[PDB]
Design the sequence.
């Protein structure tokens, strides 16, 4: 969330 | 040593100087470039952006400037979810469909390998059986890649995976010893340890635990994650330590308490360019004015606050510290998310081009 996730 | 760098195909939509395209990639900066993200349609690898086919060509075209460079295509990510992975790994027929579509896709666009970014087998909706079916998928791919290299005479396609650091995720979906034998390298996501989903501030990527932390909390740090993956069977040379070129933000419950672990009310204000509450690119934090930066002594990483905003991020010093750490443990290299979050064009931090990733390159070398 927000990047890699 | 490897320096694995993630490229993202949606950074091309950022405004002004934050826009990132293949032309903005330094061909000689990293040893491996991974393209995030590809998707899946009817169990077959597929594009996710309208111009991916063109971007793929430019991306792999970087190898004309640096022939030693290796590229991989990553499938998955958070938004992709888990259902398509679960359905695809459910049957041998579906797995074959995927495996054969992956070989064709990678060879067609000139990628040197596949990176698996399922978030995550066994979690986020994925059932327990997916822990072992993920192992089967990895074996199926390794088998197929080995076979294709043999029948075609071409260099064997590489297979890697972006894996979680959190013990809970690792236990629920990864037979580490088994999959490690079949992966060329493991991209350990040694970050996202803390985020605005939590009610108190915490650092995105601390190297060690805070002295006052105990229990499960004491394992939410890089050292614990590395120890975990090594203890469970990952060859040191295959363990690539992830590094974040971004930080995670929080809005404080009170400007009077700006400590690590202080009460938070939710995500920090979205960045002007990244526009995603809860995170900020390094270039959005490196030049904060009227702010206060402090280093977390035990964790060897910094945080910065201003009014009711608090952000834990990584800087040149923490990246240097982490590379010293990975070298001491004899790890295979560093991995980084992501190229477009570092100050790639050197427009914000007054530290030149790619200040963070260049630090990784210089320190590794």
Sequence:
């Amino acid at each position: 969330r927000x990047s890699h996730x | 040593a490897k320096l694995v760098c993630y490229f993202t195909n949606w950074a091309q939509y950022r405004q002004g100087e934050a826009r990132f395209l293949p032309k903005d990639l330094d061909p000689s900066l990293c040893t491996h470039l991974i393209y995030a993200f590809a998707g899946m349609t009817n169990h077959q690898l597929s594009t996710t952006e309208w111009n991916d086919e063109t971007l793929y060509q430019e991306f792999n075209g970087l190898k004309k400037m640096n022939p030693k460079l290796k590229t991989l295509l990553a499938i998955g990510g958070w938004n992709f979810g888990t259902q398509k992975f679960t359905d695809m790994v459910a049957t041998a027929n579906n797995r074959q469909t995927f495996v054969n579509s992956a070989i064709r896709f990678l060879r067609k666009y000139s990628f040197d390998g596949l990176d698996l970014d399922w978030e995550y087998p066994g979690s986020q909706g994925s059932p327990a059986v997916d822990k072992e079916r993920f192992t089967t998928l990895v074996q199926d791919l390794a088998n197929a890649f080995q076979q294709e290299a043999q029948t075609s005479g071409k260099e064997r396609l590489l297979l890697s995976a972006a894996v979680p650091a959190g013990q809970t995720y690792v236990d629920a979906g990864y037979e580490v010893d088994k999959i490690a034998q079949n992966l060329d390298f493991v991209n350990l996501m040694a970050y996202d340890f803390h985020g605005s989903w939590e009610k108190v501030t915490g650092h995105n990527s601390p190297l060690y635990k805070r002295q006052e932390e105990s229990g499960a909390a004491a394992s939410l740090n890089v050292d614990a994650a590395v120890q975990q993956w090594l203890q469970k069977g990952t060859p040191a040379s295959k363990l690539i330590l992830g590094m974040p070129t971004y930080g995670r933000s929080f809005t404080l419950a009170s400007s009077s308490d700006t400590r690590v672990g202080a009460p938070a009310t939710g995500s920090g204000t979205p960045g002007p360019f990244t526009k995603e509450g809860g995170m900020l690119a390094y270039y959005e934090v490196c030049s904060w004015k009227g702010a206060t930066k402090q280093r977390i002594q035990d964790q060897k990483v910094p945080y910065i606050f201003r009014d009711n905003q608090w952000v834990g991020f990584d800087d040149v010093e923490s990246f240097k510290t982490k590379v010293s750490y990975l070298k001491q443990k004899g790890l295979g290299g560093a991995m980084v998310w992501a190229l477009d979050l570092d100050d790639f064009a050197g427009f914000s931090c007054n530290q030149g081009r790619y200040p963070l990733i260049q630090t990784l390159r210089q320190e590794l070398s």
Notes: Chain A touches chain B at residues 1-5 (CB under 8 Å). Chain A has no helices and no strands.
